[PDB]
Design a protein around this motif. Structure first.
Motif, PDB file in Angstrom:
ATOM      1  N   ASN C 137       0.772  -1.253   0.000  1.00  0.00           N
ATOM      2  CA  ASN C 137       0.000   0.000   0.000  1.00  0.00           C
ATOM      3  C   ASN C 137       0.801   1.300   0.000  1.00  0.00           C
ATOM      4  OD1 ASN C 137       0.674  -0.802   2.721  1.00  0.00           O
ATOM      5  ND2 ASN C 137      -0.513   0.990   3.364  1.00  0.00           N
ATOM      6  N   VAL C 142      -2.792   0.016  -4.872  1.00  0.00           N
ATOM      7  CA  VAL C 142      -3.317  -1.316  -4.562  1.00  0.00           C
ATOM      8  C   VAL C 142      -4.623  -1.650  -5.286  1.00  0.00           C
ATOM      9  CG1 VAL C 142      -4.279  -2.770  -2.735  1.00  0.00           C
ATOM     10  CG2 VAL C 142      -2.201  -1.457  -2.307  1.00  0.00           C
TER      11      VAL C 142
ATOM     12  N   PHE D 124      -8.573   0.648   3.468  1.00  0.00           N
ATOM     13  CA  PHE D 124      -7.677  -0.329   4.080  1.00  0.00           C
ATOM     14  C   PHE D 124      -8.455  -1.504   4.667  1.00  0.00           C
ATOM     15  CE2 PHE D 124      -8.895   2.198   7.741  1.00  0.00           C
ATOM     16  CZ  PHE D 124      -8.936   1.288   8.785  1.00  0.00           C
TER      17      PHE D 124
END
Lengths: 360, 362, 360, 371
Positions: C137, C142, D124
């Motif tokens: 990342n 990504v 994330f």
């Protein structure tokens, strides 16, 4: 007697005040050390170099359970009560660490102790005692019934907080580690998780490893030590049990994570987990407690993805495990046992010398 | 006396000659049954309704290991030697099934048993005895030391092949299952595994389940049975477990035997229980052909591919069916018993059971 | 280029000829490395610093399965095909190691690759591709679809035995380890069991650890290295995938044991497995092979209690893992990637100087 | 359409109002069903009988995790995001259930969907999509890219509470169970522990089992049902090859509850699914990928925040846990039968025809057994 730091061994992290598992408030540790006889072993007659170590997670009068989780490095050994831990994430009563030949006796003795100490209505909860072993076969008459019910009661009743005796005591009495004298070792870490201090305490019963694998503070030390090889009469199954206490309010699955960190601490010290080496870790929380038949008490709750908190705890396990293993070696004195087998304590002067050369 | 089939209970599959775990050649079973005293319980004084059941995978003289794998349905109970099984996929020595209060005594007695018999240089291998429990707390003085080392030696030495005694015997003596009398049950299946036949044998020590969940041959039978509710001193009254031992002569690797063990749950499921929170329900499977000479080369006479459905499915089905039947066989074998404090638990009524089966399966 | 030994890092044991996972005969490794773009990252536009690494256990033409077993140090990550490994003790087809954002693309591409490649009758066996990830990342876009099917095919088809490229390649391309440049590392050990020799090969995709925990040959080296800290514009979730190959004819449960040894090698190098660090090990045997729909081929059989044999193999896993990790660091060069994030390769000159000082 | 109870199949316990997984408040379910083409299969050209089923534990807009735990009956199959569940006891994002050939496409599509919907700073948390499969190989062109990203998005976006479509829909579209038509089934139970009520909802994607083992309400029913054997090109599949039970089976079980359970307790919930499966007769084939995942909707973990555990349950509290466990067993048992009843006869790839378990015959059998 000096512990490992005292001899110049560096470790990272800040220990608790006692640098022991009893830095976790309310944990009590008791040992019964059985040392009798000398010379040739005859099964049933000794010599005996054995014992039992008791850890009461919440103290000897508690009827409550503690949240718990375990991990296996290599499962060639016994640790009872672990199916219970796996299933319901807690265990009741004390942890007993002892020699392999004593497991059944200790298991039943713990039940007997409950009958005389625990309210009869609560006896139901005392039926899955937690007993683990390592094998003291070089120094002890393993099959010889050297440990008695009275020995176990004494350890159960005599357990206390405060400084913990290490070395050739309790379950560790007849153990051998890294080809030096094995035994009991303990260490703790106080870790800072944002605004809260938590303690991680570790006690090991160490009976594992080879001299040529041993690393202390990253120094491969076996080749640097002169002499101190085991002897038989004057002529020149492993295991390791790791108990982790924390006052962090962890759930059972989080305590499995804690237990899984022990292997990293073991790794630091060089061993590679032998095929028959029973290497186990059990972690429990003293703040996540489950009153018998009651509502579990979880004072605060931690997110598994809270790396600030969890990493501080994990680092604490790895560091305290590493140091507990070295503290054991340094605490354990030379011993001659069954069949005049002699195993030396890692020599302090040579260790201190090596640490000075490496860490001015 | 009659077993479940004899009362007209239908099951699928072909049983071995004995319809017992000893249909697996070389397996030996022994019981010591401790029944003494009546009336009020006083700890240390009985009454005792307990015992121990011994299974020697390769017979009592063997020092070798058997390949093994286990499964947990609900892990609130004890079964020693299992970390060993998980790690190295074998265990040495006998399986002992007993009452919870006897575990430590049986464990140490099994070690003692080896002493003097086993060569000193081989004693190391006897240090992880396999001992499992269920709790006989209503009928037995659990903490009262009713089981002696001699009782354990007797079961170890007395074990044999041939027909296996079921019901209120050995470790099953004081157990309660589905609110009826619990105990020992056994069954087997001869399975057609591709181009070869194997035997799967199952022995259970049953101390689990509720009457209102019990299904026999799919029939929810608790409500069809009249009376036979447990009594306290002759008045109808106002922690469980189940141990399953699977033997097979199929030459299975340890991970494959874990799969076998995991099938036991499906057999348990057929009979209706739902695995209570405190119900210690476990299964252990071993192969009698994949043997490991002490300190020698593993003997694996043949090898089976896990993706060989013809072979594996026959074995798996065998585990399910033999488990299902062993559970019912236990109930049928176990007779009404009065034990500690005059607690009384009824064997499932044979006449009523037969009537129900006849009504449901014309 | 120099590898860790060439810089004076000592390790124990004897590497195979290539000191790589390909020292296990028949194993093939391929990388596709995707490096394009510079400057500010915009999702879908790069910059891209990613790739995929393929490991064919029995070579790219094999339709057979290999006996396998896995271990989890910390399971916060993905590795597909692992339920199959746990259940039936084998997997079919290649291992793919890649970036987290590429998992699904790689997964489907591996199926596509099998189509035509594999007889239609055997396509059933290609439905559970093994794909594992670490997160690139900081250096990579990504979510930006930087990896294509063609990239994956290229790695599958281009895979080969012989020397394995290490460092910023394939799946390791955009990784960061111990706050230095992460990537691919590999090592092997030839181990002795009496007269029989076996090879244990290890390949890592390293994206884990903190500089201050890093220990190379036991030396806590982060504090000894000057500079080399990461930058953004010139101003100053983890994971580790470990693949273990061996030609020892091990059964699946024995390979789980091998996989569990990896953590000990990781431990030697100082990390403590962060809460969000996906650290996994997979071990397979190239001699215990299972022909599709046929009889498993097990040329010899090892007793789990055969310490001589098993410990040799265990020691090999630990050593090769330890060395693979250091080899990764040494092979990985400084890289600037997305958002001008710059991560330094561990400085060769400093490492060599430190090793010379420590190990004269 | 009638569900199992409407055909006279008896079950124990009390279902929620919907008798579906969505009886657990806030759970949303969406299906995309792909049915196109007839006749001979050519890889890449269909026919297609596949799809995807989406379950949003906390609804499609939630960024939060749910506590979760899993169980494996037989692990020959794929279910992604499960290492995460084992380790940290939660998962983020939706559960997707689909056909084996679609796993990677769905996995990447879920990431792509996140990019659209989720704040950049939260991406994330969207890196470990949960995707599970069963194999629709008899009715579907598995390798032929029948499922598109748009299909996935539609299920993700279209998911909702309320009644859940069952049968040949979403991930279940091309499945076969007990030699009858497989598919999606759902059920729930409202369970009592003291004055406290909790809901246990179960959804299954069923592609497992053999007719000869099938038990419905304890009745071994395969031999009682006449005909309805699978066909290929207009004749019953028979012979030493075509006449044997299918392998490469699978069964996915998703368990939702509003009980505030910790992850290890949810593992126990998931392990109860096997008993429900056992009641219905199957024996878990060697290649049958049979999996259960259980999550709590009350024990939720806001992204980067403190876990919310509104109440806490003792694992040794038999009254509470046993009620929940019994709930899982009963709901699983019923979901499996509800699946069979909901799935209609389908002809797919290579003119493979698989019959829905005949309603008239089932009802007649049930009426005879339970007068």
């Amino acid at each position: 007697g000096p512990r490992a730091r005292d001899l110049g061994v560096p470790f990272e992290g800040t220990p608790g005040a006692l640098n022991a598992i009893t830095d976790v408030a309310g944990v009590e540790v008791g040992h019964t050390t059985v040392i009798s006889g000398d010379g040739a072993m005859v099964i049933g007659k000794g010599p005996y170099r054995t014992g039992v170590t008791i850890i009461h997670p919440l103290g000897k009068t508690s009827l409550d359970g503690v949240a718990a989780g375990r991990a296996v490095i290599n499962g060639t050994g016994e640790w009872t009560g672990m199916h219970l831990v796996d299933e319901v994430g807690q265990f009741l009563g004390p942890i007993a660490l002892t020699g392999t030949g004593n497991v059944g006796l200790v298991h039943q003795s713990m039940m007997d102790w409950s009958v005389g100490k625990v309210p009869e209505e609560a006896l139901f909860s005392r039926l899955l005692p937690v007993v683990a072993e390592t094998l003291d076969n070089r120094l002890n008459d393993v099959f010889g019934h050297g440990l008695t019910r009275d020995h176990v009661f004494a350890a159960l009743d005599g357990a206390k907080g405060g400084p913990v005796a290490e070395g050739n005591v309790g379950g560790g009495t007849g153990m051998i580690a890294y080809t030096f004298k094995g035994g009991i070792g303990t260490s703790s870490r106080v870790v800072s998780a944002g605004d809260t201090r938590y303690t991680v305490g570790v006690l090991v019963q160490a009976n594992h490893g080879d001299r040529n694998d041993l690393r202390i503070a990253g120094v491969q030390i076996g080749k640097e030590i002169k002499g101190a090889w085991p002897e038989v009469n004057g002529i020149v199954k492993n295991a390791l049990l790791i108990v982790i206490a924390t006052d962090a309010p962890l759930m059972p699955h989080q305590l499995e994570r804690m237990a899984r960190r022990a292997a990293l601490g073991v790794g630091r010290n060089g061993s590679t987990a032998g095929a028959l080496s029973g290497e186990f870790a059990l972690a429990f929380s003293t703040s996540h407690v489950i009153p018998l038949g009651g509502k579990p008490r979880l004072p605060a709750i931690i997110n598994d993805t809270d790396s600030e908190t969890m990493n501080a705890l994990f680092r604490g396990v790895v560091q305290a495990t590493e140091e507990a293993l070295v503290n054991q070696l340094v605490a354990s004195e030379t011993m001659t046992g069954a069949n005049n087998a002699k195993v030396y304590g890692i020599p302090h002067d040579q260790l201190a010398r090596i640490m000075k050369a490496r860490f001015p």
